[PDB]
Each structure stands twice: as C-alpha cells, then as structure tokens.
Design a protein around this ligand. Structure first.
Ligand SMILES: C[C+](CO)[C@H](O)COP(=O)(O)OP(=O)(O)O
Ligand SMILES: C[C+](CO)[C@H](O)COP(=O)(O)OP(=O)(O)O
Ligand code: SF4
Ligand code: SF4
Lengths: 402, 402
C-alpha cells in the first residue's frame, strides 16, 4: 500500500510525515496548572505508547506550569514531545510566557478560536511569528465544533449561487476544509517552513471525516493529524474511531493519529493509546505487540477451555513483552493462533507464526501445534496450556534471535 | 454513498441484497444437540438485534435437535431465520434428516470442507440438489482457514509461470476468491437461483479482507456476507473487525455482516451483535439506537461531572429505548451531545439534535443547551443532569411524534 508523500516535520525528536511510522498521540485530562498530576499523566501516556503528548495551555497558571513539567520530564530522560493546545488567548500566553513557548515542542492553533473578524488575522500572525522565532512546528487544527462563522457564511453564499446548491451539511464540510487550507497557505506565505506545519480538520461522523481528509490530502502537501473528534464513550467510541480512520489509513492518508474517547468515570486515560495502537496494527501499518488470532468458538467447541486458553495465551504474551522487546528484535510482529476445532484450526494456525488447533466435537482428544506453516508437535492431556506457552517461548527465541 | 446492486435473497422473512438494509447476524456457541440451551441463546441473540442466527449442524445429534429448536422458536412468534453451518458431512446430514433440512432457513456450505478430490464435486452437488428441492437459499462460504488444497496448488502453478510471480500470500488470496467464484458458478449452472445464493470469502487480516471482497464484488453478482474471520478477543477483536469492514461498507460492498469475536470467559455471546450494530451505525448505514457524542475531556474540563454526565445520559437513553421505539417512530436516529467546555461545546451541540455544553475552566457556571441547531435554554446549579434528561425526553416527544 502506498503512503502519501509529505515533508518531514519533527515534533521534538519524533519525525512525522510520509517517510516515517504513523505516530500515536494522546492528550492529558489533568489541570495543566497541577504540575505533579500532569507530569505523572504525561509519563503514564508515554509509557503506554503515546509518542507525542498534548496538553491544554488554557490560562496563565497553565502557561506558568509548562516549563516545570518539561524540566521534570527531561530529568528522567523522558524525551516525549509536548504539544500545547491553545484557544482564544494563545497569542497572549505565548507573548507573556516565553519560557512556556520555548518548553513546548509544538503549538496547536485552531483557526476558529482565534477571535472575531479582524482580530483573527492578527492573533494568527502573532502565534506564527513566535513559532518562527523559536523554530517550533505548528498544527493548524480545525474542528467542526469551532468553525469560523465568517468563512461559513462565505461558503453558504457561494453555495446558494450554484445551479444545484448542496446541502447545509455539505457546505459545513466545505468550510471546515477551506478553513484549514486557507490558514495553511497563510502560514506558508508568512514564511513558516513546510517542515514546520501539520494540518487537521476533524468532524465527529466517520463518513464525513473520510470526505474531509481526502480533500485535505489533495489540496495540501502537509503531514496530516487524523482523528475522529468527540467519538464518545465505550464500545461506540472505539468502533467509530476505527471505522473512521481505516478507510483513510488504507488509502495512505494520515501521519499521526489521536483517538478521541470519553473515559468512563474511573477508566484510565491510556485506553485511547491502546485503541490507536490497535487500529494501526490491525491495518498492518505498525507492530506494537504480539497478537492472538482466535475463532469465536461455536457448538463444535468442546468446552470453556478454548476461551480460557485464548485468554491465557494473550495474558502471557502481555507479561513477556517488556523482556522480549529487549532481547528479541522484531518480536512485535509475532502472530499466535488459538483455534477451537479442525474446521479452521490447522489452516489458520499455519498462517500464524505459531498456533494450536484444539480438538472439537467428534475429534480425538489431541491438539496439533503448527509453526512456520508446518506441524511442530501434537499435544494431549493436562497442561496443554503450559506446554503450548513453552513452545511459543522456544519459537520466539529462535525466530527473533538477534 | 452507492450500494452495490444485487438480487434479493430471502433468508426466512429477512431480505438481503442491495435494495435492503444490511443485516446483522451472529452464531450460537452452545452445543446444538442441547435444545434448551440453543433455543435460549438464539432468542437472546435475536433480542439483542441478530436478524439472522447461525448454528452449527455438525453431527447426527445436532441434526435431530434442529426441528425442535425451530418449533420452539415459532411457538413464541420468534421468526428469526436459522442458518445451518455444515462441514465434512453436510451431504449425509441433509440426506438422512429431511426434517432438519426443512426446518433450516438457509444452508451454509464451505467449498474447502466438502471432502477430498473427486468426492468434493459430488458432495457439493448433493447439498445444492437438496436446497433446490426445498427452495432453500445457500451461502457458499470460503475461509482461508479451510482452503481447498487442490485449488491452491493450481493457482500456485499458474503463479509460477508468470513473468513476475506474486508472493505465496497473494496466491492464497487469489485461491480463496477463486474457490468462492468457481463454486458460485457451479451452483448457478446446476440451476440454483440467483435469488438463492449468498457468498463469503473470509480472511483474518483487515487489508487482505478488503482486497478479497473487492474481487468478489467485481467477479460476481451475489449478495455478500462480510466478516473478518477469527478477529480474536477484547479490544483487538473489536478494532480489527471495524477496521476491516469499514472500507468495504463505505464503498457499497456487503449485504449482511457477522463480527467474529472470541468471548472472554463469562462474556456474553451478544457482544458481537452490539459491535456489528455499532459498525453499521458509525458509518450511517443503519440506525439502531440513539447515540451520544462527547468530547474526551481535557484540562479545560472542570470536574469529574463531565464524565459522569456523559455516562448518565448514555445510560438513560438505553433505559428509555424499548418504550421510545414503540411510541416515537424514527427515534433510533437521535443524536445527543454532551460536551466539556466552550471550545467545541456549542458547535458540536448545534450539530446534534440536542446537546449540552458544560462550563469549563474560566467560564461562568452555566450550561447552554441547544436543540435543532439553536439555543434552547441555559442550565445552572444542582440537578443539571435531571434537567437535561427532561429536555431530551421533551425533545423526543415533539421531534419523533407519530
Ligand atoms: C481538544 C480539542 C480542541 O479542539 C477538542 O475539543 C477535542 O480533542 P480532539 O478530538 O483531538 O480534537 P482537536 O484536535 O482538539 O480539535
Ligand atoms: C464458523 C466457521 C466455519 O468456517 C468459523 O470457523 C468461524 O466463523 P466465521 O468467522 O464467521 O467464519 P465462517 O463464516 O464460519 O467461515
Ligand atoms: S474453528 Fe471450529 S470451533 Fe472455531 S468457530 Fe470455527 S467451526 Fe467453530
Ligand atoms: S471540548 Fe473542551 S473540554 Fe472537551 S476536549 Fe475539547 S477543549 Fe477539552
């Protein structure tokens, strides 16, 4: 599959663009002024796999905290880049708090939260000037929840002159794209480099997101920050996010992703990082950790042992990963199968690196194990689970040896 | 978006094809011979939204149970169609147990589990003959876990003659498609109607599934049963399934879906139905229930109240749905927003049918509510949650009145 070529934008030490792995990012939900809480959550998110972390810089007390948060991160060798999220008063905060401006690795601007009418262009120019002075990259990030009303009215009037006007909904999507593209072009014209500009234009419906990003990809050369905004809670948020991103990622569009989940009360903020990683890995774009392929089970499946075994294998693989990642380069690509009966068991197992096919209904009580597409052994009796996990360990040591 | 046109195939009373809603299906995991357990699970799945339910018919005792399961379903007015899943001995079971053959609403055949060499064609013909005699529809369902080895060798040899041979992996995908297409054409040639044939060709990797179904859609006219086989457990299974199906559904390919999740020990079998519904609804293809759009929350968000409120609104909407579905036609389309601050709160709320924007950091402690894109009221104090839910109820009564 062919990735859209783009210039490289470094966000701290992390390169993003068409020549680089698609980067996972996230955002904190602690008050930025709370240095201890925010530092801890940045570290938690980074350790979960957030390669870039965003934090809101909403007021003066937030701005004053940012240099200390960065200092603390660096003191433990955590080189995770920080993106500051600015709305309404970004120009004032960046002007008044130069140490915050220098401590951030990237500024996020929203062309719909710059101020009204004439103030907009001036506030934009000031934030871009500061970024240029400090050599910082910028994301120009549009969101349909904060669309520039003057631009919307301009495009509504253009639409009304068409021989067949489009729907109001379609015009909103046009305006969102136009907001991002106009601001991109303005920033380039002011002298901000192509190696310093990332774009997003987010909406909260999957089919609309696909249209928007196809337009952005066509009309601009910038790396794109992709996400389905306001995806919501639980299973709904997870599914909507994956459904929205996949068609675009498969087409080669997108250079960094963020998954916008609402945590349930007491649910960890790291869930969104896990989902982002799973999207990229599902599409074969990155490898973060070994994966288990398993059938759903059906009436052919002999007992609850199948579900238990699949769960145990997944759990063990998670426990071994920190060590394996250190010793066995490439192990993140490991595919393990655990299957319920002979119908698909051998075949699916032979497509994995290693897999086991349990005996289902009507079969002799033995479980063949396949590795690299051929029979490795046949297991029987008690301790199938512990035997198989030993065989997986043995496999990893040989296949992913340095 | 434009749906691929196809003939209509009735599965019991449920029509599938390009002129009809994309149908959600599932499969039982109880032993089919256990009439009480299987009947109960069929009912559970149907009540969760499984429009078609599949059950394995693996042996003689399974076959003998099917008529009683169907009888019990019909006794409670549950007209849910049953698909029988046959492997290895389907021809023997359908021949020996005509009451099972008549009680099923559809037969699933796997061209890779028919038997070896010469036996294959005969077993296929017999199952198709029985379907034709009884006026039953058939799914010819290929799976890469049970690929016909003779066909694979044929295509491996064709590939080896190419000036630039493809990879072994690519040949497997070619063979999977060819298996389904050849069997489709054979069944048509035997006289099975176009209104009696559904096709699937499942693989366990998302990008490969997209290639396969694009080929099936091009080379055949049949309605397509789409699924990512062996998607696995937990978040991984959910994300992979959504990621695989979305690009195809957005392109108009697919007439019925099944989500192939491995339940965790003690996790309900209905989870896969919930995920299938969420995929279709995320893509705007079906509406099953009201949805809540909510931001992730960030450091602008004032307290834990935001996450609590979003959760409470979602919970209330789920509680009201059975009643609402009866009284208020079209309510399944309801979009509700719950947002954390002024940045995107008003704008996202104005895109929903009704939404609330909480006050975040720096804002006065008041929460505007929007409905049909304009200000409805402004809430303050305690009981915001109960006030908003009353306003949502009031909205539904007026907007979705019969
Ligand atoms: C953080 C923010 C400002 O527009 C949001 O409200 C939601 O976060 P998000 O879904 O990642 O979308 P943004 O990048 O923030 O537009
Ligand atoms: C049931 C079956 C027979 O091929 C499977 O093993 C898995 O179920 P599935 O993922 O829905 O795939 P199938 O339609 O069954 O091929
Ligand atoms: S591999 Fe066997 S046990 Fe697993 S779902 Fe398929 S037919 Fe059922
Ligand atoms: S709407 Fe406000 S509270 Fe919600 S994530 Fe966005 S900026 Fe943060």
């Amino acid at each position: 599959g062919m990735r859209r070529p783009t210039p490289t934008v470094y966000v701290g030490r992390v390169p993003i663009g068409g020549a680089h792995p698609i980067a996972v990012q996230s955002m904190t939900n602690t008050p930025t002024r709370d240095v201890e809480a925010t530092t801890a959550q940045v570290l938690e998110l980074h350790r979960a796999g957030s390669e870039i972390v965003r934090l809101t810089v909403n007021d003066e007390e937030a701005a004053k905290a940012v240099p200390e948060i960065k200092r603390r991160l660096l003191a433990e060798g955590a080189e995770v880049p920080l993106v500051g999220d600015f709305h309404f008063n970004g120009h004032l905060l960046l002007r008044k708090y130069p140490k915050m401006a220098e401590a951030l690795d990237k500024f996020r601007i929203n062309p719909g939260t710059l101020g009204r009418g004439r103030h907009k262009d001036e506030h934009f120019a000031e934030m871009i000037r500061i970024a240029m002075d400090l050599g910082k990259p910028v994301r120009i990030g549009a969101n349909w929840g904060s669309l520039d009303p003057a631009l919307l009215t301009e495009l509504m009037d253009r639409n009304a002159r068409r021989p067949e006007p489009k729907s109001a909904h379609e015009v909103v999507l046009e305006a969102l794209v136009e907001s991002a593209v106009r601001a991109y072009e303005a920033a380039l014209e002011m002298g901000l480099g192509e190696d310093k500009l990332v774009l997003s234009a987010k909406v909260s419906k999957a089919r609309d997101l696909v249209w928007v990003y196809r337009e952005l990809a066509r009309r601009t050369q910038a790396p794109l920050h992709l996400g389905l905004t306001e995806a919501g809670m639980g299973v709904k948020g997870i599914v909507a996010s994956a459904a929205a991103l996949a068609p675009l990622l498969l087409e080669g569009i997108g250079d960094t992703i963020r998954v916008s989940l609402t945590p349930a009360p007491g649910e960890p903020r790291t869930k969104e990082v896990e989902v982002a990683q799973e999207i990229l890995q599902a599409l074969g774009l990155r490898a973060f950790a070994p994966e288990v392929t398993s059938c759903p089970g059906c009436g052919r499946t002999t007992s609850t042992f199948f579900q238990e075994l699949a769960e145990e294998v997944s759990r063990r693989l998670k426990e071994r990963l920190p060590e394996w990642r250190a010793r066995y380069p490439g192990v993140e690509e490991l595919k393990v199968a655990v299957m319920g009966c002979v119908v698909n068991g051998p075949g699916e197992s032979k497509h994995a690196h290693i897999g086991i096919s349990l005996p289902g209904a009507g079969e002799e009580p033995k479980a063949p194990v396949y590795a690299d597409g051929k029979l490795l052994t046949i297991l029987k009796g008690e301790g199938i689970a512990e035997e198989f996990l030993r065989l997986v360990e043995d496999y990893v040591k040989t296949r992913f040896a340095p």
